[PDB]
Design a protein around this ligand. Structure first.
Ligand SMILES: *[C@@H]1O[C@H](CO)[C@@H](O[C@@H]2O[C@H](CO)[C@@H](O[C@@H]3O[C@H](CO[C@H]4O[C@H](CO[C@H]5O[C@H](CO)[C@@H](O)[C@H](O)[C@@H]5O)[C@@H](O)[C@H](O[C@H]5O[C@H](CO)[C@@H](O)[C@H](O)[C@@H]5O)[C@@H]4O)[C@@H](O)[C@H](O[C@H]4O[C@H](CO)[C@@H](O)[C@H](O)[C@@H]4O)[C@@H]3O)[C@H](O)[C@H]2NC(C)=O)[C@H](O)[C@H]1NC(C)=O
Ligand SMILES: *[C@@H]1O[C@H](CO)[C@@H](O)[C@H](O)[C@H]1NC(C)=O
Ligand SMILES: *[C@@H]1O[C@H](CO)[C@@H](O)[C@H](O)[C@H]1NC(C)=O
Ligand SMILES: *[C@H]1O[C@H](CO)[C@@H](O)[C@H](O)[C@H]1NC(C)=O
Lengths: 167, 572
């Protein structure tokens, strides 16, 4: 292939893409995605990174809104962000740790923007719905057994009455 | 008083016109099937029903006795009137079992047809439950466990077999217990279906996109109006719903007073049955149109989401009202990207969905489960509807079994060898053993076969034989004179003409058209579930299934001619 693309980079393998749909989750009464919303999103991501590095690795790292670098902003509200070192921009946090941090504190990020796990897609971090807890076995079997027992008792009573009448 | 009206309504309202009619109507394009049914009612329903009622009233005998008194070499037709009914008892009670199943899964807050099962990662949904609706997946997999093709059939599924056994036990209990208390039972078991249908009609009309189904059901498409299969199905369905051919009407008429009015009774019964079937179709097709509209909206939303994701548009920029314009703009902007996903875009329209939203023998169950899942208190409405449907099925099965057992009850030799009460148990056991076939993995295909052919040709042939015997063998003038002597006000010329040269001619013409269509097409195919596509695909019938259907039809059709030949041999 002759030529080159202005969109690829060796560190683009550590980027996480975020896609946001404001007017689908909220319909009306939906805020516009200006720079202030981007600042709030970067602060939420930095908070999630801080929480992950404090509650797992026992390392106090002072992330900030300048350590979550964002590129490729589009009117869809779909960009690529990557989290770097606090003051060592040349150092990029590996994508696995970023994904673990996002998974750990995704509910807070969703609550900060009033989105729920479907209008805020991280394209690589798929949420888990939750196991459908089951009764001991089910209710169809118990009700079926009760009904068939009642039917058998009634049939036996009717047969006994008929035999007595015929006797 | 109102007791007679309630009894007539109960005799007219049955599981047939509630369940089978919507499925046939959806299969044959809605209005293109509805129009013949009204045509087939005023031509075949009222005249033949009144003829059967008059014969039963005048002869003062059972079906076999009446058709033996009319002519010796014709008496065997009465035997046929049992055999077909037996075939009904082979499979009809199976429907009740399904109702039982759908009742037993009605006491749970997480209704089985409400939430799709998880794939296993607890992250998404099953592919079968995603491509198809939750109700459809529950019906075709968690209830019937149907196989993709009829050729492969598994073992007898134990839960459906247990449900069928419970249904047969309930039928036998009702046979033993209920013999004359129905007069009180008519006070309650005749109006509940109408109330349930009113409630479900209200719920359907309160749903978004409900008028589309009503418009579809009342649209008389001329393209599919010419199909003889629609006429044949309408004729057999009206005959089955009115009970013609089964001989129960003759037995009931033999128990009435000779001065009892028959024309009014027949007209009222036919009109009530037709109105009830139309009302049930209205409610079912309102819910069906709701389902089709929901599927259409979901498809449009998926297409818009894919376009927005792959072209980075605004969230609300792309809507249903301006889809094709945006598609054209994207094509004119960069056709390479548009063509990179052009095969992925799906063309979905209201007509295609309404044609193939939900279809099959369980249209009523799927449609009403979908309606229930969008209620406020789903469990209560589910229990009420399934109890009503089960009660209707129980009543219909009780009538059919009484009609079957009456010739056996009148058998002096049989009564002298075994107790009368044990005969009912033996019949129930034999019917359950025969109907356990439908509980297999592919038992739904056999149920469809025995719902499409076990009463299609047999009832038509029985009705044709009966009307020919009444019009020409016994003598129309003699029958009219006897009826005038019995009650006065001899039959009007309308009824005489219909009995003489309208109904038999129409039956013969419809049979000839159906035979010609089958011979020309030669491609009798059945719908089969496809989980990979999550839809229904037409597949050619296998040789053994076609032979079984042919044998089932042939036994009922040849029951009468064989006995006629035997009687002729005995005379000679
Ligand atoms: C901000 O973040 C950036 C990172 O983004 C950070 O910069 C890094 O700093 C570290 C620490 O100084 C650098 O690591 C140094 O590398 C020196 C260069 O020599 C080595 O270079 C290659 C490093 O690969 C390492 O890891 C691989 C995989 O684990 C391993 O195989 C290597 O052996 C090595 O450990 C390496 O490829 C290279 O290989 C030599 O040998 C092969 C034969 O095996 C031969 O073929 C090669 O040609 C080559 O000769 C070589 O090993 C290295 O000198 C240095 O080691 C000395 O210093 C450390 C302490 O720093 C001592 O512990 C050690 O004993 C030595 O004295 C160290 O390994 C890393 O390269 C930087 N990366 C970048 C991108 O800059 C900044 O410091 C951060 N800044 C702040 C303020 O936080
Ligand atoms: C579920 O996990 C398995 C693990 O191998 C994976 O292959 C599969 O794709 C996952 N399901 C989905 C829907 O991604
Ligand atoms: C939809 O319509 C287009 C327009 O001709 C056609 O090319 C395509 O095959 C149709 N079907 C699908 C699934 O896109
Ligand atoms: C989904 O599952 C993951 C692990 O499988 C778990 O961490 C997460 O809390 C779950 N989310 C729910 C149940 O909402």
């Amino acid at each position: 292939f002759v030529g080159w693309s202005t969109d690829w980079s060796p560190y683009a393998d550590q980027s996480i893409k975020v896609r946001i749909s404001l007017k689908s989750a909220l319909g009306d009464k939906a805020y516009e995605w200006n720079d202030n919303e981007m600042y709030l999103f970067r602060s939420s991501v930095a908070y999630a990174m801080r929480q992950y590095f404090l509650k797992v690795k026992n390392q106090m790292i002072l992330f900030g809104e300048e350590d979550v670098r964002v590129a490729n902003l589009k009117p869809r509200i779909s960009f690529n962000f990557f989290v770097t070192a606090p003051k060592n921009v040349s150092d990029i946090i590996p994508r696995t740790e970023v994904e673990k941090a996002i998974r750990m504190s995704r509910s807070r990020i969703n609550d900060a923007f009033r989105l729920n796990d479907n209008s805020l897609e991280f394209l690589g971090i798929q949420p888990t719905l939750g196991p459908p807890n089951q009764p001991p076995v089910s209710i169809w079997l118990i009700v079926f057994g009760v009904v068939m027992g009642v039917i058998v008792v009634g049939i036996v009573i009717l047969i006994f009455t008929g035999i007595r009448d015929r006797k | 008083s109102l007791q007679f009206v309630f009894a007539c309504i109960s005799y007219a309202v049955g599981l047939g016109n509630v369940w089978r009619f919507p499925y046939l109507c959806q299969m044959y394009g809605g209005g293109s099937f509805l129009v013949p049914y009204i045509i087939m009612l005023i031509v075949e329903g009222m005249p033949l029903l009144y003829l059967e009622l008059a014969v039963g009233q005048r002869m003062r005998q059972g079906s076999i006795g009446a058709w033996r008194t009319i002519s010796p070499y014709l008496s065997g037709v009465g035997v046929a009137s049992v055999v077909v009914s037996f075939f009904l008892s082979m499979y009809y009670n199976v429907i009740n079992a399904w109702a039982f199943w759908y009742l037993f899964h009605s006491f749970q807050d997480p209704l089985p047809w409400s939430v799709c099962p998880l794939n296993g990662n607890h992250t998404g949904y099953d592919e079968e439950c995603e491509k198809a609706s939750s109700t459809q997946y529950f019906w075709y997999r968690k209830t019937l466990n149907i196989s993709p093709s009829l050729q492969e059939n598994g073992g007898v599924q134990w839960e459906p077999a247990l449900c069928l056994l419970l249904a047969w036990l309930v039928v036998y209990l009702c046979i033993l217990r209920g013999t004359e208390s129905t007069g009180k039972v008519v006070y309650f078991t005749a109006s509940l279906p109408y109330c349930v249908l009113i409630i479900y009609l209200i719920r359907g009309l309160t749903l978004h996109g409900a008028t589309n189904g009503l418009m579809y059901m009342f649209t008389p498409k001329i393209e599919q109006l010419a199909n003889p299969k629609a006429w044949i199905n309408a004729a057999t369905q009206i005959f089955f719903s009115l009970g013609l051919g089964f001989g129960s009407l003759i037995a009931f008429a033999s128990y009435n007073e000779p001065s009892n009015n028959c024309q009014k009774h027949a007209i009222i019964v036919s009109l009530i049955n037709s109105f009830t079937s139309i009302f049930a179709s209205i409610v079912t097709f309102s819910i069906y149109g709701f389902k089709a509209t929901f599927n259409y909206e979901n498809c449009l939303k998926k297409v818009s989401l894919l376009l927005t994701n792959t072209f980075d548009l605004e969230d609300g920029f792309l809507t249903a009202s301006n889809l094709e314009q945006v598609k054209g703009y994207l094509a004119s902007a960069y056709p390479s990207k548009y063509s990179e996903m052009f095969p992925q875009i799906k063309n979905c329209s209201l007509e295609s969905e309404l044609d193939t939203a939900v279809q099959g023998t369980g249209l009523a169950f799927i449609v009403y489960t979908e309606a229930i899942k969008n209620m406020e208190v789903s469990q209560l409405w589910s229990v009420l509807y399934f109890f009503m449907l089960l009660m209707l099925g129980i009543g219909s099965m009780l009538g059919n079994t009484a009609a079957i057992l009456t010739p056996l009850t009148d058998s002096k030799i049989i009564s002298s060898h075994l107790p009368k009460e044990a005969i009912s148990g033996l019949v129930c056991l034999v019917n359950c053993a025969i109907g356990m076939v439908f509980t297999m993995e592919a038992g739904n295909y056999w149920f469809d076969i025995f719902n499409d052919y076990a009463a299609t040709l047999s009832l038509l042939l029985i009705v044709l034989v009966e009307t020919i015997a009444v019009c020409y063998v016994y003598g129309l003038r003699r029958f009219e004179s006897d009826l005038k002597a019995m009650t006065g006000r001899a039959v009007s010329w309308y009824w005489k003409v219909m009995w003489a040269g309208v109904s038999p001619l129409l039956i013969v013409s419809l049979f000839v058209f159906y035979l010609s269509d089958y011979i020309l097409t030669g491609t009798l195919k059945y719908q089969a579930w496809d989980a990979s596509q999550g839809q229904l695909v037409t597949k050619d019938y296998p040789a053994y299934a076609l032979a079984v259907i042919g044998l089932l039809v042939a036994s009922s059709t040849m029951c009468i001619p064989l006995a006629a030949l035997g009687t002729f041999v005995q005379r000679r």
